[PDB]
């Protein structure tokens, strides 16, 4: 039934805004306020303001009250938020929901729906598309009959990129690694996956790297 | 100004187990309290609300309770789709502030890594850059300490290393470091060595290449 569906994932200069939307489907979208939160890197939620669609009236904590504005479109049933003055401590993941109870007969806050989440990165780095480097097998055989390959993906800003292997046909022991920052100011990862290492060399593998802000799709084949 | 504090920081416990993590709240909010679960890349997920009462959806294993300022949320027979991070969440006053959060962590029978290495790639070398990356694969805990050396020389500030989130069919986690030089660094040296400690190691396995 109720799914709200977030904007894609940005990256602003220090200074600049940031305007983040979030899309609700399935209910009356006048009537049930919309909050917004976010998560700064292993900090926990902080909650930012919210907005009553039906009216457009807004209540932001006094500690964002002169940077973030909550902006409705009500026919297509969409709420916006746009935060200005973004810093380094803006990097957060941001998150839209469903008050609950200004719809209900209850007193609480309730977000029983929430979006999917929305990355923010705030950093001086321009956008740089990725190179990426193959991981070859080698006599890299342990649990007996079992080679390791991989693909680096190195030196891309912002986050995400999307990895995968053989168009998506490889899911089977597949760990693909969370980017690491580094003091260039550039993300790197790295994706592996476990095949038993007789097939190498009968079956070819190919890792699928997509870095959609740089417009960028490289296919690279990993052989021994 | 309602500051909310959650006891512990992570733990771990296995399938089955009853476990029970607290909510402080700094001032008095009655029953204004709730519960939300949420896996890493996912929404979160209203659990309890009104600080005892179950959210529809929610198995009947989840169990709240709590008045005042100290507030406990009680999972009786774990499931391993119920490890997540665990927050609450006071709706009696503005601001709306939340937790730190409970990482809840799946215990399983400690499994050994497979220690694989790799040289960096002839395409890379040609870019004038070299990335030495070494993988740690399937094992529990999440603690293992990785060490590069070169000639029996080892390095310090110039390796970067990232863990994988906890896996969902063996509860295992995968830990790759990449040690990062120049091209003419690379060159310079033979022995690329890559030891690891790890809990469920005996002795610390080296695994190595001379390229």
């Known amino acids: 039934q109720v799914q709200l569906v977030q904007s894609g994932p940005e990256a602003k200069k220090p200074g600049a805004s940031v305007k983040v939307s979030c899309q609700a489907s399935?209910?009356?979208?006048?009537?049930?306020?919309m909050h917004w939160l976010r998560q700064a890197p292993g900090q926990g939620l902080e909650w930012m303001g919210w907005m009553n669609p039906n009216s457009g009236g807004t209540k932001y904590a006094q500690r964002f009250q002169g940077r973030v504005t909550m902006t409705r479109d009500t026919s297509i049933s969409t709420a916006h938020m746009e935060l200005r003055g973004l810093r380094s401590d803006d990097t957060a993941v941001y998150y839209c929901?469903?008050?609950?109870?200004?719809?209900?007969?209850?007193?609480?806050?309730?977000?029983?729906?929430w979006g999917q989440g929305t990355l923010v990165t705030v950093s001086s780095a321009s956008t740089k598309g990725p190179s990426v480097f193959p991981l070859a097998p080698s006599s890299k055989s342990t649990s007996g009959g079992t080679a390791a390959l991989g693909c680096l993906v190195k030196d891309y800003f912002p986050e995400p990129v999307t990895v995968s292997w053989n168009s998506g046909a490889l899911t089977s022991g597949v760990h693909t690694f969370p980017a690491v920052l580094q003091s260039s100011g550039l993300y790197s990862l790295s994706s592996v996956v476990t095949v038993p290492s007789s097939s190498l060399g009968t079956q070819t593998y190919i890792c699928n790297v997509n870095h959609k802000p740089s417009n960028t799709k490289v296919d690279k084949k990993v052989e021994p | 100004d309602i500051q909310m504090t959650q006891s512990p920081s992570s733990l771990s416990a296995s399938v089955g187990d009853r476990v029970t993590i607290t909510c402080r709240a700094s001032?008095?909010?009655?029953?204004?309290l709730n519960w939300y679960q949420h896996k890493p890349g996912k929404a979160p997920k209203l659990l309890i609300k009104?600080?005892?009462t179950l959210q529809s959806g929610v198995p009947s294993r989840f169990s709240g309770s709590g008045s005042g300022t100290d507030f406990t949320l009680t999972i009786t027979s774990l499931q391993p789709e119920d490890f997540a991070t665990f927050y609450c969440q006071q709706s009696y006053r503005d601001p709306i502030t939340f937790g730190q959060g409970t990482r809840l962590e799946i215990k399983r029978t400690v499994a050994a890594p497979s220690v694989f290495i790799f040289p960096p790639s002839d395409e890379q070398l040609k870019s004038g850059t070299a990335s030495v990356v070494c993988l740690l694969n399937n094992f529990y805990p999440r603690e293992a300490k990785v060490q590069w050396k070169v000639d029996n020389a080892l390095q310090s500030g110039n390796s970067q290393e990232s863990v994988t989130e906890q896996d969902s069919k063996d509860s295992t986690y995968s830990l790759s470091s990449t040690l990062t030089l120049s091209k003419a660094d690379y060159e310079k040296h033979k022995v690329y060595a890559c030891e690891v400690t790890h809990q469920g190691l005996s002795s610390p396995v080296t695994k190595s290449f001379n390229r």
């Open positions: 009104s600080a005892s």
């Open positions: 399935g209910y009356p979208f006048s009537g049930y306020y």
């Open positions: 929901a469903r008050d609950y109870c200004t719809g209900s007969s209850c007193y609480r806050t309730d977000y029983d729906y």
């Open positions: 001032q008095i909010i009655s029953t204004y």
